[PDB]
Amino acid sequence: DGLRPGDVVESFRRGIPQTLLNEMGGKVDPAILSVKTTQRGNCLPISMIPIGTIIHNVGITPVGPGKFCRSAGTYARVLAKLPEKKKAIVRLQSGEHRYVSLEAVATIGVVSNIDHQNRSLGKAGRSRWLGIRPTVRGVAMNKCDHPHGGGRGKSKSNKLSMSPWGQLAKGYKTRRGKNQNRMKVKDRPRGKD
Amino acid sequence: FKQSNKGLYGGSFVQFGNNISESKAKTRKKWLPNVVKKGLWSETLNRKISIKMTAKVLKTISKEGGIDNYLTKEKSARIKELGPTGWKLRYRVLKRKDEIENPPHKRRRLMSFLYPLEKLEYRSVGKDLNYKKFVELFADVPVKDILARLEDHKFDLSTITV
Amino acid sequence: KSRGNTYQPSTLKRKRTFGFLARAKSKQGSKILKRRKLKGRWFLSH
RNA sequence: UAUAUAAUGAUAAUUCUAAUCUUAUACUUAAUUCUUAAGUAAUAUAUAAUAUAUAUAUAUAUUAUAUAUUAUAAGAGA
RNA sequence: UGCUGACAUGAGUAACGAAAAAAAGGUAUAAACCUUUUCACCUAAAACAUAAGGUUUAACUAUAAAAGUACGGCCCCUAAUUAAAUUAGAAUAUAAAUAUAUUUAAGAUGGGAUAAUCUAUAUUAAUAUUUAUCUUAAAAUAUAUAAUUAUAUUAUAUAUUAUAUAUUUAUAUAAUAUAAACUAAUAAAGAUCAGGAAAAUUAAUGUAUACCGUAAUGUAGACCGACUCAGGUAUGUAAGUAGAGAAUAUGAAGGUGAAUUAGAUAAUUAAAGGGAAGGAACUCGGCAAAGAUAGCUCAUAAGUUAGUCAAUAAAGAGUAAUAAGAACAAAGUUGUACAACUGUUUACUAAAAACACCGCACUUUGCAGAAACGAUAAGUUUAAGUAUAAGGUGUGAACUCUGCUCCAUGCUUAAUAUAUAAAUAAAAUUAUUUAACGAUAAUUUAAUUAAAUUUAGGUAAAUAGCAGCCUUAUUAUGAGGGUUAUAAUGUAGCGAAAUUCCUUGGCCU
RNA sequence: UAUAUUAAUAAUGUUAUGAAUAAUUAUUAAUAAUAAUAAACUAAGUGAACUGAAACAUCUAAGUAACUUAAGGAUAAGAAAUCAACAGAGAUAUUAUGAGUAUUGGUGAGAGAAAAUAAUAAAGGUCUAAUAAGUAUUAUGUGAAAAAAAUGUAAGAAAAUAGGAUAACAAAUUCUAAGACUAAAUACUAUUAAUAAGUAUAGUAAGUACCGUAAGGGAA
């Protein structure tokens, strides 16, 4: 968010540099590392990011890229650290608490363009430019097409809201059963908000 | 069932049959063997052969005491069970066992010695000779001659060294 | 508008899709050529 | 009173792994893009000895057996 | 309504397919062919030059001429995409066929050096979408007497005069000369919708210049339409006059005037012009037709979402017009219903109130993911994206607002509540056989053993639902009230509605 | 660059001051090549639907049509872990009787054998295997309409002092699975000869003209 042409950033994914280690001025002994870490823009592992920090570009593995909280105005918070399990608990923009590798990547600060959600396309041509073709509602279709189709006049056919291929579209958990998220402390609000 | 050419399936293929309902309605269905990917240690090759087999074939390995034994059994049943791949693995195993069993001595340096002489003679008469055609000509000539130089050794391809 | 003019000639497409190679370079086209030969047709493909 | 210390099972949870699974990157003789069999110059492992403090453990010359001239790194895991 | 073949009737009937033609001559042969003249028609084409296509149809067999600098192809390079090709026994998957991922090869609608002062491609020596061209600058002129503006010019395209040559090749240049359009090369710069891939220099030698296209047709008699078919068909130039213009009028050159002609012009039909008196009295309906008092410069209201939206406002003014005296552009207000709007739709009877939309809500998916595809898998799109992303669903901009209910169908969360199906390490037990043991076919039990199922919630911008009955203010009528059923009993708003049968409902204009 | 190249008799025009030449050598030895690849018959994988049952789903059609793959002049089968019934036979493959009998079925439409006796046929009996183990058998899901050997998943023997065969048991018979070869009688095609109460609309053209973009259709 606060990044402007002129600023200076750095990454500590490889680690603290010899430039400071040998100089002893900014080395860990006086613990200037805290104030060198919790500044927006730079990149650090969760291990050396303090608790409660607002971060973005979170990884899953110690050797993997930043995957979560990568869109405009998105951020996550570091909730817990578990050194014995080499894990950390992070809450994502979905409101979900999740386990992540303690030595995973993360950048300090919110992702820019916070107001991207207040934008308003004024015409269908703008969607067409962006690459979005028209969407045809199921009710407007025929019964051979979307199940909602058919019926004289406007009618929903007493058919539970569902996709064209017969999958319920209101509240039906799609990821269900044994194949769920192994790394998941708490689920997202899911209507609480 | 070309899936089986790549593995040791023990001569078991897919089975296409019917699915019967309580109303005795039929619907075509298919039975697959229980293929499992496994790496079995081979002593003669001194390495792990990694292949897809059926659990039955793996159990047969456990009985017979090794992938080498399984591949090198003699019965026609086994010859049929061992598919195209198994056949090649069997060839490798038996070749390796043979070369371990009987080493060559239980000629290439003399070919090298004779190479320059023939090369020079061909050069003198106006022709040429390269290493490939040289070995092709003198591949199968047991008896050598002493037309030039002197044989100051008695190796004679028998009991090399003291 | 008016109909009837569905065939719009273009030698490039004619040869690419109905040419001899377009059929001899595949399983199905090879079968078409073989069937026409067996029937004894004079002209196998464009 | 007026059914588990033990022997076993069921359920829940955590741990380990060569079960399983997913991502990433020089010569000598012998049968001149090759192989094999014995030894090597340097890149790497276990236990015995150098010499340190507490009354279970550091760091190295050199040697003992199996190898490179599939593998590592990360993740899930009975 | 048999099949094929031949021949009839309709019948010498309808038609001969947008069209200007006339003489003289070729020819005492001609409406139809050729020539000359006259007349017309197309002329931002019916002309010229081309692409694609095609029974060479052409000005033809004696026939369409290329080393390249305006010659295309061929060739180098790649896009989209394609490929019995490609990958320690082993690239992955798959009833076969085959399908994935990677390589390689192919593949334009694209890019590719030099060149009129004319030019040289080969071998051996190193490895830049799209759009625009200032309020303001300087001289001299029209400028006024400090204006300031009015302009070549605030940037390019070349030919002449002079100051000089190496026996006048390249320069340093000071002067002279543009009115309006357009072109290819600069320089600077505007929005967001953020704008292709691919093949590297000097030296020394070297070049005898391969192959193929080239006619004519190409808003068409030369292609696609069964036809010498009023249909379909890609580019550039497209005289001048006039205009804002590629509108409209003319038409200089060019091309053309047609497999139907000559008379006659009844009823009647089509296309077109005029019309007394009246002006929608026609009709289901002003359907059709008629109606324009500048086209430039001014001026232009109520509403309004503040957008000259309404607006190209209406009415009106200025400019020669005063009896009129080209074509073309321009065809008035107002209420209501539906839909925010531009757009899309039933190729060939429906263009709309239907679809879409921007906007608004709900919901799923933490990425080793939801969604779709895959005789099914690998795998692919999603996406080289990450909850402000992607999929699904309903509604359909915005103002004012969106009330009550989980009964039912589902979704969703827990209940140490609860059937069972398959799967086994044992035997409290009958039947059969057997001299016999023994061999064959069961019911109960285990520390054992799901999802469902029913219990309790939550969920309606999920699918859905939103009632009846009776007197009191000595009256029609019913603020209060009394009663049965329910999950609850239709709130705000609107109302004879595109929803009202009765119904031309009652009243007003 | 199969007129493509180390070696040779001499060189034009030149070789950073007796050899090595972009047009090349009478020459001689060595080194990369050429997919015309039918049909029918046979075996195997997957396999419909119309239809019949006077409807329809079990059943039928039917393991047929079609697609896919792979051989040979043929392929396939083949010398009993077979039949049979106390007496016996003795390998395959077709045909007649047995016989529309046994058997079987929403006991419906319907389907349906083997012993045994004859015919065709060839010399028709042979050894190649250290005699056969995740095999026989068992449970379970499928599996030629009667009759059955293969087949997914998982447990799993014995040695001729043994094993297979029948719902089961006993007795008796019969044969030896997990190793193999095999002419002939047969199928298709192509020639030759013979006979046609066959064809001139089954009598030679042409898969042409022509129709469709194509697969494909198809004349006189």
Ligand SMILES: [Mg+2]
């Ligand atoms: Mg997109």
Ligand SMILES: [Mg+2]
């Ligand atoms: Mg939308």
Ligand SMILES: [Mg+2]
């Ligand atoms: Mg929509």
Ligand SMILES: [Mg+2]
């Ligand atoms: Mg509809």
Ligand SMILES: [Mg+2]
């Ligand atoms: Mg449906």
Ligand SMILES: [Mg+2]
């Ligand atoms: Mg509808």
Ligand SMILES: [Mg+2]
């Ligand atoms: Mg047609």
Ligand SMILES: [Mg+2]
């Ligand atoms: Mg195509």
Ligand SMILES: [Mg+2]
């Ligand atoms: Mg008549």
Ligand SMILES: [Mg+2]
């Ligand atoms: Mg008449």
Ligand SMILES: [Mg+2]
């Ligand atoms: Mg007439």
Ligand SMILES: [Mg+2]
């Ligand atoms: Mg005349």
Ligand SMILES: [Mg+2]
């Ligand atoms: Mg015009």
Ligand SMILES: [Mg+2]
């Ligand atoms: Mg003009």
Ligand SMILES: [Mg+2]
């Ligand atoms: Mg022309």
Ligand SMILES: [Mg+2]
């Ligand atoms: Mg050229």
